[PDB]
Design a protein around this ligand. Structure first.
Ligand code: CU
Ligand code: CU
Ligand code: NA
Length: 463
């Protein structure tokens, strides 16, 4: 098996700057070369390392021949640097943003947010990681040797043409159910192996799929110890046998490497339209882990962090966000799926503006509302009226989930989150915005099934 590629850990220079170049190159997948896009490379991108309380300047060079934007998913930053659809970087052009990092240690990420083209641009290869550290997490003595016992694991599906090229389309089927493929990549590689020291192994898991939800486990059912969600450390580890992960979510887990036997990280079949088609109808390997006897000192602590209590609900502003899809899209989309795959498509169970929030397809010129600054609000996000999956992402914030799709959040989902599950039911988040966003550089809130977002399931808001 190819060894697991490790994104380079990219830190500030002597002048407190970092450079990111967005460009096209070539990658090879199962023998065939394909045109791919990457940050500082051909595919995917580096892990940008930031420290809480320290400002960095990022110089972004768009070396594509089309426009793009750069969104820091999970970062509590002003709208001006948030890199939503209004953050255009012209082809051949350079844009610089200042990130004044002020949030707990977390694994966040970054990716394009081009208006109507976000799905395509991510599918082409654009994504990178953000490793935020603070004064608290380094006290914990977690595994910390980057690319040895502290390893990013970015999992993504793709579909390829006969000629080997990435086979991406925004059409009626994908507008409805998403873009998904038959080939699983792990940091850009197909079924790689990673050499992990005996002791504790830390995985920073990112579901970087456009539309595919995942569910991590191990081939021999050894447990995962969840230590962190989107926006950082949980209060204490949560021990699980499997870990569902929605599109754009991150969890950090420890896994015990307590003998010499190789095992796989795997993903288990999910109940989502289109996602349990072969070979995802069965547990699917993600990467092979090969235990090795080299130095490690990482441990699993009893106690990780202390988070604030949930705010009192009395007197909070309530915002209702109703998600919907044009009936025609739903049936048309389903028709194409059934035509393409047949009964397998339901196993485990103008379209360009057919996806909506509060009866409106995204209008870039009209923020739906102004949210309060520095005050908790309760946002109620409903998917009642359809049975599609919607990982709902709110920019500019790490929030607390009050209810997820009908129930209190699972323990490992009760900490800091930038995404909440909405699937035929209603969710509630308690959300606070510590930074401003004007109408000209508004925050986005949207489904992170990218083809839904691209076809209207998004709103802008100011702070
Ligand atoms: Cu985001
Ligand atoms: Cu959606
Ligand atoms: Na504990």
């Amino acid at each position: 098996r190819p060894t697991l590629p490790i994104p380079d850990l990219l830190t500030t220079d002597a002048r407190n700057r970092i450079q990111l170049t967005i460009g096209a190159g070539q990658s090879t997948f199962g023998g065939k070369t394909a045109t791919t896009w990457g940050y500082n490379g051909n595919l995917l991108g580096p892990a940008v390392k930031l420290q809480r309380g320290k400002a960095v300047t990022v110089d972004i060079y768009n070396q594509l021949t089309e426009e793009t934007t750069l969104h820091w998913h999970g970062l509590e930053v002003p709208g001006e640097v948030d890199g939503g659809p209004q953050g255009i970087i012209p082809p051949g052009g350079k844009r610089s943003v200042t990130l004044n990092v002020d949030q707990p240690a977390a694994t966040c990420w970054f990716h394009p947010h081009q208006h109507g083209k976000t799905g395509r641009q991510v599918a082409m290869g654009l994504a990178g990681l953000v490793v935020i550290e603070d004064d608290e997490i380094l006290k914990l003595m977690l595994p910390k040797q980057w690319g040895i016992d502290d390893v990013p694991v970015i999992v993504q599906d793709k579909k390829f043409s006969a000629d080997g090229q990435i086979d991406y389309q925004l059409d009626v089927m994908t507008a409805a159910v998403g873009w998904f493929g038959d080939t699983l990549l792990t940091n850009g590689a197909i079924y790689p192996q990673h050499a992990a020291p005996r002791g504790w192994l830390r995985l920073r898991l990112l579901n970087g799929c456009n539309a595919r939800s995942l569910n991590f486990a191990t081939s021999d059912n050894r447990p995962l110890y969840v230590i962190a969600s989107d926006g950082g450390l949980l209060p204490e580890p949560v021990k699980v046998s499997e870990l569902p992960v929605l599109m754009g979510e991150r969890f950090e887990v420890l896994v015990e490497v307590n003998d010499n036997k190789p095992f796989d990280l795997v993903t288990l079949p999910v109940s989502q339209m289109g996602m349990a088609i072969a070979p995802f109808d069965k547990p699917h390997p993600v990467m092979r882990i090969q235990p090795i006897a080299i130095s490690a000192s990482g441990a699993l602590p009893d106690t990780l962090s202390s988070l604030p209590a949930l705010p009192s609900l009395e007197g909070l502003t309530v915002r209702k966000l109703q998600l919907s899809m044009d009936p025609m899209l739903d049936m048309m989309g389903m028709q194409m799926l059934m035509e393409k795959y047949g009964d397998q498509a339901m196993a485990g169970m103008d379209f360009h503006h057919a996806n909506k929030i509060n009866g409106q397809a995204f209008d870039m010129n009209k923020p739906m509302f102004a949210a309060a600054k520095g005050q908790y609000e309760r946002w109620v996000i409903s998917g009642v009226g359809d049975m599609m999956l919607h990982p709902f992402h709110i920019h500019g914030t790490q929030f607390r989930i009050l209810s997820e799709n009908g129930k209190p959040p699972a323990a490992h989902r009760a900490g800091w989150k930038d995404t909440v599950k909405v699937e035929g039911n209603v969710s509630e988040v308690l959300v606070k915005f510590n930074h401003d966003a004007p109408k000209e550089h508004a925050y986005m809130a949207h489904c992170h099934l990218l083809e839904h977002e691209d076809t209207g399931m998004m709103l802008g808001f100011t702070v």
